[PDB]
Design a protein around this ligand. Sequence first.
Ligand SMILES: *CC(=O)[C@H](CC#C)NC(=O)CN
Ligand SMILES: *CC(=O)[C@H](CC#C)NC(=O)CN
Ligand SMILES: *CC(=O)[C@H](CC#C)NC(=O)CN
Ligand SMILES: *CC(=O)[C@H](CC#C)NC(=O)CN
Ligand SMILES: C#CC[C@H](NC(=O)CN)C(C)=O
Ligand SMILES: [K+]
Ligand SMILES: [K+]
Ligand SMILES: [K+]
Ligand SMILES: [K+]
Ligand SMILES: [K+]
Ligand SMILES: [K+]
Ligand SMILES: [K+]
Ligand SMILES: [K+]
Ligand SMILES: [K+]
Ligand SMILES: [K+]
Lengths: 347, 351, 366, 350, 347
Amino acid sequence: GFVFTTVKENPITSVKNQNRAGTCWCYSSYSFLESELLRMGKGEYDLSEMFTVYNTYLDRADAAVRTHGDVSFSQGGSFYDALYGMETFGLVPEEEMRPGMMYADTLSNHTELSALTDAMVAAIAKGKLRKLQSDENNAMLWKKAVAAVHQIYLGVPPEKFTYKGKEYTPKSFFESTGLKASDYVSLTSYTHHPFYTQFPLEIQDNWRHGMSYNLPLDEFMEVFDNAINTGYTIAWGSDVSESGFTRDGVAVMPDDTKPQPQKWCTQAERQLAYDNYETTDDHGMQIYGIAKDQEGNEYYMVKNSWGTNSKYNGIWYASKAFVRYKTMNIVVHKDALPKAIKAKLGI
Amino acid sequence: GFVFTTVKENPITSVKNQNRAGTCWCYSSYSFLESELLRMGKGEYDLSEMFTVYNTYLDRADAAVRTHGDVSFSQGGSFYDALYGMETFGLVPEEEMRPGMMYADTLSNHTELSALTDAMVAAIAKGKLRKLQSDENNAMLWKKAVAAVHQIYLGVPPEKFTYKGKEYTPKSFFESTGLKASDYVSLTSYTHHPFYTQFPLEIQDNWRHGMSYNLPLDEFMEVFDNAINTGYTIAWGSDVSESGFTRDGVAVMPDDKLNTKPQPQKWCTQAERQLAYDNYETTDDHGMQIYGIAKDQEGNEYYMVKNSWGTNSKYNGIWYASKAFVRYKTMNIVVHKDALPKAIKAKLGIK
Amino acid sequence: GFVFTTVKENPITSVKNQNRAGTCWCYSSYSFLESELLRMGKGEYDLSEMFTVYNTYLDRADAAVRTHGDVSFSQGGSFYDALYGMETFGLVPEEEMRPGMMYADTLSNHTELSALTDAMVAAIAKGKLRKLQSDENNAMLWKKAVAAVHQIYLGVPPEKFTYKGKEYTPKSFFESTGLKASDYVSLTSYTHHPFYTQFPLEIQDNWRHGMSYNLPLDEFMEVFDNAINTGYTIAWGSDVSESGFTRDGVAVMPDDEKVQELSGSDMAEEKKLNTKPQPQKWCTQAERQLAYDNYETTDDHGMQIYGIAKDQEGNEYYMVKNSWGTNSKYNGIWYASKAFVRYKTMNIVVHKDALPKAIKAKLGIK
Amino acid sequence: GFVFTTVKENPITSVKNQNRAGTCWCYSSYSFLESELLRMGKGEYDLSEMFTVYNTYLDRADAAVRTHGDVSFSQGGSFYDALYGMETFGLVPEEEMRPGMMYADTLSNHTELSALTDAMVAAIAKGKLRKLQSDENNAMLWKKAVAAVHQIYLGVPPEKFTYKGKEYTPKSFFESTGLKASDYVSLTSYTHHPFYTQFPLEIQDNWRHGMSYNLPLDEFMEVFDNAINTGYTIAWGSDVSESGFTRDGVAVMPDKLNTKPQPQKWCTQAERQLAYDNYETTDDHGMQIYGIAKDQEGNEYYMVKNSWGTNSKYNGIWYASKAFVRYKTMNIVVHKDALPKAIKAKLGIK
Amino acid sequence: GFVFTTVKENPITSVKNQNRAGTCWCYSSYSFLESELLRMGKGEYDLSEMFTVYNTYLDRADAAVRTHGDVSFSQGGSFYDALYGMETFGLVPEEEMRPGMMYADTLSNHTELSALTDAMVAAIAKGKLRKLQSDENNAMLWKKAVAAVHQIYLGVPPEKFTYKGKEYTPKSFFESTGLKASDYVSLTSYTHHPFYTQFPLEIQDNWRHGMSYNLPLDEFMEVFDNAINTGYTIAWGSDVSESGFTRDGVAVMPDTKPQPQKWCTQAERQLAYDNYETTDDHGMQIYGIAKDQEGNEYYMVKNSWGTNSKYNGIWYASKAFVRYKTMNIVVHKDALPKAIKAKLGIK
Ligand SMILES: *CC(=O)[C@H](CC#C)NC(=O)CN
Ligand SMILES: *CC(=O)[C@H](CC#C)NC(=O)CN
Ligand SMILES: *CC(=O)[C@H](CC#C)NC(=O)CN
Ligand SMILES: *CC(=O)[C@H](CC#C)NC(=O)CN
Ligand SMILES: C#CC[C@H](NC(=O)CN)C(C)=O
Ligand SMILES: [K+]
Ligand SMILES: [K+]
Ligand SMILES: [K+]
Ligand SMILES: [K+]
Ligand SMILES: [K+]
Ligand SMILES: [K+]
Ligand SMILES: [K+]
Ligand SMILES: [K+]
Ligand SMILES: [K+]
Ligand SMILES: [K+]
């Protein structure tokens, strides 16, 4: 079996449960940002995923309709969706917009909401309508319909609320927190773009076309350990549809249940897996620590959003070889970058 | 050409325009009900079609979902939809729900509303969902979604309103009128059911399965003249997808300038009428109101028909349908009980 | 395990097998009608399901074509299909139309018949034909084709036949039995219609739009015990797509919270939910309505309830005669707990005289 | 009828014919780029549309495969496709890749090529393959197949060629011209983004997500006249699916609608925004505006060089009224120095 | 269990692996042709299946386009495809075109090649194009495209080559071997055609409409034993979608151990062909006769699925199974009994 020993770990919040929704991008983004609030001495927070998920879907439907169905309308998203959301829509506390509250449950189940909204967006974006209807204020009626259905299944967004003695608006609550999206950068490592440049990752959930800095694979992994050792956490978006990532919580990349010698990939081998569909933008998580196994092979400690009903109560151990091979992109505070890597990027 | 002379005509309301919506069933039903209110000395009314159209679509979506997509969800309907609707939902005046008010228009255009709601109902009724979501009051969430989208395109139903100095609810306003759906019967003439019995017409827009009394074809046409001659109007449902039905205001069934001048008409048998209904040649296309009788130069008889396509036609929205066309292409009719002849009424078991 | 002891059960016929066909509505209707003939002192009968199944599909194809595909064309049906069928088409004995006789079998297998007829009806009802062809007597040609294909797979309906020494027609044989469709009523229990009224159940196999009397749930279950205790059987249409409905011959509605409370384990095969008697979930009228509204209770299967039995622990069960053959634990007999029947029943059909007098007065039956 | 009198017009090249293909984006871009070369004193060029069209489709096929079918694979494109293409793939003259040369024709007909390549990309991008094959050098095999089919219908890209006495490569020939994509900016006018900012236009053919500067509608129209009056031409992307846009060579926005001068509908910023939101203004056609003309009644028109050949009333030249351009323009591309100095400060272009 | 004892067997080559492609028709055809060369004193050969598979698909695409999609375009084939192919395209040795050579493998995997070419052929044969493009020499452009894609996944056909000391062309290498397709006949046994006549089997992979001689079932089985006893091997095309066909290396027709087999009549064999119970599934080579422990007869069958099976890729098919599930066979003339051979008129 596996016996792990923590080398260094940073403060995180309680593990949440996305349940039946493709909202891992928002649950992991807020797990990362909540660790940022603890790190900045602002206390522990429980930010509402459903608030940003609601507003993001409204924007994605607009993107799908404007591109006549080119932008797919689905439950997925990115870390930039939350970074854009906090500046554009703001933030609200979890209690204001609770998951499943509208269908008498406590966890998310968006299968029926998707079934209706997918059909609605497709009827507009991929239909034969030649003129979309609007009211006397030039407001689109289909946007009202899509927003109304989303509110019935996710809830009504509050315009004002009281939280811990203070009355807030979604934007003033975001300013209350003091986070700012300008202080966070997205990082990747691929060869179909020049190094030390910015490009938007060609993945379906990046319909906002958020940019990422391109780093060499070895310098890319240097940011991982530097972020943990400096007191930072990592928003980790990676492929988890591999034989090495199991249910138990161990994500390894063995060289073909126990520690085995791992296969350390080249920059070209990593590129081919991204080129041949073997590495896809599947899951978003948070890396908050480093650990070792019995044989000394390294691991990153990962906080998932699948509840606490696992061997390590919702904490997974991803080997450094697995992270080097299957990572799609990461988001960390710019200050977590090493000074040399940070100068190379033109920050 | 045609030169018509009125034999008898009964009071009707102004001609309305259904426009870009399949709501002819409601506009003709309210044209019939408004003439009924005039007939009983209650005055002129302008009832809101969009109110009944809104509530009917909500029920039709429920029928489609309960039957897992068997009941088609479309814009059509029947006269019974309005008779059932006034007793269940009530009535509101036109000013409380106007057509097109929600998309900066004055007439209906339900193409975008249909495109959304059809996709919504299909995602539920014909999808792969095995358990539909509900709140803590056991209210279906999909019904809230379908109702919300309908309100965005058709308007919000009023719960109370002021009309001519008095505050009403849709239920209390219907009671003002004094009409009763029990006092109206649906009549048809086919042979795939026994005569003088009741059966629901097997047409898509009869998803409520409202029943109709079956009469022989000759006795069926007797109700037409008896209703008009005694002072009643007829809610008329007929197939208008024939070469004889023209945009010039006339609807003839000529025997072989077939549609421009009066010609000898083909008077169908009961079997010939049955075949056209069996072989798709007679379908539930259009709903109108028959309110009068007219003659041509050569003495052939016509029914004066009030359409719902506006007034931009040869006779300002009025069609002249020959009795031969009406005998052949009528799907069903709805009249007050007292418009039937006493002998025919006794055969059907009415009181 | 389960140990059942009969409290009261009424005479039934042998258990039949529908096999590979969605004809449970007819087999259960005839299990009910055969029990009615035994109760009325008419003897044992073996009514031909394939005769009624043939004629019902012809009417269902006509409904699909007339409604331009709105009425779905499938193998299902209702109890009213048999009640309407015996008055319209009549009855013939089993030996005159046996299942599988046309493809060298003894049991039904209508997969190929459905594959052809579904495509035929759809080509007419959902096609782009604007005028269907007819002969010089105004008879529809597509109806001849659909009937011809049905006869090739099900057999030719007899116009005359000899049964036990006498020559019959399907109509005259039905009159011999002395049954009358007027003596049977359909009952249901839902809230989307007023109680003590009649409405047609909004289910696909009710394309004939037969009516059912609406009763409160407690009064609805009163007809079950009163019919069995007075000597009548019940045509039972119910949902069987539940975890409690097992292939072992039991149909239960266990309360998961209580079973896990009585379990030694916390809330976080071995649960034994359906293998032994457990505390049942006694649904409310609203809980029953929600399951019908949210697709959790659907018109799946038609069976016959003919008796009442209790287990070792005294819980009540309805004895159910299925149409899946006798290769089961109780040889084709199921024990359905009253909680399951109260929760998952779509509708039932019983003789009028099986109703309590008070329930009969509230509905207006004479 | 119409009788137009020119006010000012700038040098253009001969009118070409895109024919069957939906390559208007490349033909109009090269009409614009050829006018830029004349303006900068480099002479006339006849740039190969098929060379850039070939390389653009391979990039679009890769984008469709990477996004699992989200990026649509079709014949369309944008002006940025040519600006990116000349810097990435370079430029070759028309004689090195001619239209229709591979199927014994002289004009483009890409209906069969699209039928094959659309099915190929869809089988990869939207199929059920879970691992795409590659050779020993990690080169994707499907990319070889898509490129091979494109070469069979469009021609083989030259690796070296001789033009006017000197041997060139596609990269070296582009450097000879002296063009730079940095000297060209994309401009639009919409309100769903802040003014004087950059955003990618949400149209299918902008799959590269090229940015455009957002200007108020009145300042947007100021760039049109300033560019023409100072000697520049405009790459004009606009909606042509209107009743006012006729095949006779006129494009009007009437309030005999398109046969005589009539009062025009002067759209607001909101009216222009609504048409873009409700599908009434779509990225349909790319053309080049190179001059200004008169009505009999003094109304203003932009002289437009189309890419539909010369078999029209004005031999492939359109007159677009200033009201039509104000209402139906999606975006334009001009040299930076065609912008007024004040507008350049608001956008921050140096 | 089973214990088999060989009665008589003929020389064969090693078992090969088709791996992941429907090229069993060519691998078995060349197993038959290689055994044909051994009996004729010509030595051992390894003919390239990928060469014939490449050219056969080019002809099948032309057949699909000419019949506007009626002829299906798939990976399957027949024994006549190889007999026609060797006379039309010739023969090349294996190492000049190897499976997987183009995608860094050693065995075939044509799933991606099929996904592309199927879509290409369908776009032409079943599309709405009303005039297909051609060059100046009247050569079809779509044929160039389909051929180019096939070469990218299967390899470039050699036009000249050196083998064993001499330079050959596909003409000349086929002539070197000395085989002639006229010396090979296809045989079947059905009643929907008159006996002792020729008809093309109504199966999808017989799109070339190659003919087969129709024999009564008992005389059909006489050719099996006569071929083995006289020194010939049999190209065996048969249905393998039965419960009796196991991955353990035996093919029985029971009425793991020897059991009494069911002896089908001519009508029972015909019904299975009429009601889809016997379909053209697999092509193999019969090269011998064997007994089990209990003395009932078996045919020794050489498969093309590699050698990781209980009998190292070789199956034992009972004579009752072959009598029931055989679609057609190909043998040399002289493998036929003399009495049957006059009835068919072959001289
Ligand atoms: C006349 C109309 O609008 C409507 C359209 C349909 C279907 N027709 C009917 O409802 C007739 N049943
Ligand atoms: C039980 C059965 O055979 C049939 C299957 C189908 C469809 N179900 C019904 O008829 C439901 N009453
Ligand atoms: C104008 C043209 O050919 C093309 C249409 C297609 C495909 N349009 C564009 O490329 C710009 N939208
Ligand atoms: C045996 C095989 O691979 C192939 C199936 C496919 C595809 N079968 C044939 O080629 C002849 N039936
Ligand atoms: C829908 C869906 C899958 C989904 N993936 C993403 O959102 C992309 N990171 C998820 C977190 O479950
Ligand atoms: K949270
Ligand atoms: K993967
Ligand atoms: K009205
Ligand atoms: K008609
Ligand atoms: K029976
Ligand atoms: K169920
Ligand atoms: K050019
Ligand atoms: K337009
Ligand atoms: K070989
Ligand atoms: K088989």
